[PDB]
Amino acid sequence: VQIVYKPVDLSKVTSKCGSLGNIHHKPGGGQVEVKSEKLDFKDRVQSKIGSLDNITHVPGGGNKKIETHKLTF
Amino acid sequence: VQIVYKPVDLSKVTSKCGSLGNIHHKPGGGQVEVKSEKLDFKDRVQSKIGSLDNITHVPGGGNKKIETHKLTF
Amino acid sequence: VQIVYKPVDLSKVTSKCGSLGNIHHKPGGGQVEVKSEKLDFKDRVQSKIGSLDNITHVPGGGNKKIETHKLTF
Amino acid sequence: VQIVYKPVDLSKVTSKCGSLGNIHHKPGGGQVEVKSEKLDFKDRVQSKIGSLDNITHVPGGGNKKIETHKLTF
Amino acid sequence: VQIVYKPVDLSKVTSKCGSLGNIHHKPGGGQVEVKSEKLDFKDRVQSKIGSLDNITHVPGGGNKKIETHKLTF
Amino acid sequence: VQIVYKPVDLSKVTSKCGSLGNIHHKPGGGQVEVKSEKLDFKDRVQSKIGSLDNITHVPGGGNKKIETHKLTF
Amino acid sequence: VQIVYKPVDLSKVTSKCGSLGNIHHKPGGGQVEVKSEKLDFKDRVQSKIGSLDNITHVPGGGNKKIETHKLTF
Amino acid sequence: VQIVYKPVDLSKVTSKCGSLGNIHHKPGGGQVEVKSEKLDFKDRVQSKIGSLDNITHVPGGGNKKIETHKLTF
Amino acid sequence: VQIVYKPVDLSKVTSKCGSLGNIHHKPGGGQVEVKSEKLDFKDRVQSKIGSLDNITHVPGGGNKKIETHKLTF
Amino acid sequence: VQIVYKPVDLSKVTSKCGSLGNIHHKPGGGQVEVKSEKLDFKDRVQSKIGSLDNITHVPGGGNKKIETHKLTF
């Protein structure tokens, strides 16, 4: 039995921008209630309860090359 | 049995920007209540309860090459 | 049995920026209540309860090559 | 049985910036209450209860190569 | 049985910045209450209760190569 | 010439209540913009521009006897 | 010429309440902008510009007898 | 010429309350901007610009007899 | 010419309360900006610019008899 | 010419309260900026610029008889 695994990337992920400029983010403040009795979180759980989070995310180039190579015999 | 694993990257992840400039982030303050009796968190849990978090994230290039190589016999 | 594992990176993760400039972050202060009786956190838990956290994160290049190589016989 | 593990990085993680400049961070002070009876934290727990933390994080290049190599026989 | 483990890094983690400049951080003082009866923290616990901590973190290059090599027979 | 002015009030303005009880007032935070050049206010003006005001008004009896007596010769 | 002015009040303005009780007032924080060049306020003006005011007003009897007597010859 | 002015008040302004009780007032913090060049305020002006004021007003009887008697010859 | 001015008050302004009790006032901290060039205030002006004032006002009887008597010949 | 001015008060302004009790006042700290070039305040002016003042005012009877008598020939 023989296996050869040899993938090749010459790939370009690229951007040009003259200026990002006048971004404004101005949210009025909302309201939240959450009510419960019992929570069980039991394997690899991600959770987010009753949050009011505001995000401004303004990268000078935010491109990405998420990648995966897997070999299982 | 023979395995050869030899992947190759000449890959470019890249940006150019003239200026990020006048980002403004001005959130009014909201309101949160969360109510519960019992919480059990029992394997690899991430959690976030009743948070009010504000984020400004303004990188001069925020690009990424998240990557994984795996071989299992 | 023979295994050869020899991956190669000539990879560039890169940025240019002329100036990040006039970032403003000015949040009004919200309000939080969280109520509970009993918390059990029992293996590798991350948790965050009732937090009001504000973040400004403005790196002169925040790019990344998060990476993993694994071999299991 | 034979294993050869010889990964190679010529990898560049890089930035250029002309100036980070006029970052402002001016948060108004919110309000928090958290209420409980009993907390048990029992293996590798991270926790953060009722915090009001403000962060300004402005590195002249904050890029990273978080990395991991693992071999298990 | 034979194992050869010989990973190679010619890797660069790098920055240039012309000047970090006029960072301002001016937080208003919030308010916190936290209430409990009993705390048990019992193996590798981190905790942070009722804190109001303000951080300004402005390094002239804050880049990093967090890394791990592990071999288990 | 003769004038007699002699009005009489035996009037009752009255209330009874067993309890006002569980009033709740929980408004989510709206948003306002107002834009103008020139305002002239020149005799007995009352004005209110761009306000976001919330009121809870819960009197244990809020009845009233607004009244006026006038004689002009 | 003769004028007699002799108005009489035996008037009752009155309340009874068993208890005002569980009033709650919990507004999320909205947002306001107001813009102008020139304001002239020139006789007996009342004004209120861009205000965000919250009021709870809970009197144990808030009744009133606003009144006026006037004679002009 | 003769004037007689002899108004009479036996008037009662009154309340009874068993208890005012559990008033709560918990406002999240909103946000305001006001912009101008020139203000002229020139006779008996009241003004209030860009204010964020919160009021709890809970009198054990707040009733009133605002009153005026005037005679002009 | 003759004037007689002889108004009479037997008036009662009154309250009874069993207890004011558990008033709570817990405001989160909002945010204000006010901008101008020139202010002229020139006769009997009241003004209040950019204020963030919080008030709790809880009198054991706050009733009033604001009153005025005037005679002009 | 004859004037008689003889107003009479048997007036009661009054309260009873059993106990004021558990007043709480717990403000989070907001944030203020005010900007200007030139101020002229020129006759009987009151002003209040950029203040953050918190007040708790809890008198065991705060009732009042603000009053004025005027005679002008």
Author numbering:
A (entry chain B), B (entry chain D), C (entry chain F), D (entry chain H), E (entry chain J), F (entry chain A), ...: 306 to 378
The paper states:
The Uppsala APP mutation (Δ690–695 in APP, Δ19–24 in Aβ) is the first known multi-codon deletion causing autosomal dominant AD. Discovered in three individuals from a family in Sweden, this mutation gives rise to a dominantly inherited form of early onset fAD. Post mortem analysis of Uppsala APP brain tissue is consistent with typical AD pathology, showing abundant deposition of extracellular Aβ plaques, primarily composed of AβUpp(1–42)Δ19–24 or an N-terminally truncated form, alongside intracellular tau tangles. To summarize, we solved the fibril structures underlying the tau and Aβ pathologies in a transgenic mouse model and a patient carrying the Uppsala APP mutation, the first known multi-codon deletion mutation in the APP gene leading to AD.
Immunogold negative stain EM with Nab228 as primary anti-Aβ antibody, which detects the amino-terminal region D1 to E11, showed that the sample contains a majority of unlabeled fibrils with a diameter of ~ 20 Å along with a smaller population of gold-labeled Aβ fibrils mainly observed in larger clumps. The 3D structure of these unlabeled fibrils was solved using cryo-EM, which reveals that the sample contains a majority of tau fibrils, mainly paired helical filaments (PHFs) alongside some straight filaments (SFs) (see below). We solved the structures of tau PHFs and SFs to a resolution of 3.3 Å and 3.4 Å, respectively. Additionally, from the human sample we determined the structures of tau paired helical filaments and tau straight filaments, which are identical to those found in sporadic AD cases. However, in contrast to patients with the Arctic APP mutation, Uppsala APP mutation patients also exhibit a minority of SF filaments, whose fold, like that of PHFs, is identical to the SF fold observed in sAD patients. Therefore, the tau pathology is identical to regular sAD even at the molecular level of tau fibrils. However, it is interesting to note that the PHF/SF ratio of 27:1 in the case of the Uppsala APP mutation is much higher than the ratio of 2.5:1 observed in the sAD case. Hence, the data confirm the presence of only a small population of Aβ fibrils. This agrees with the fact that AD patients who carry the Uppsala APP mutation show pathologically elevated concentrations of tau.
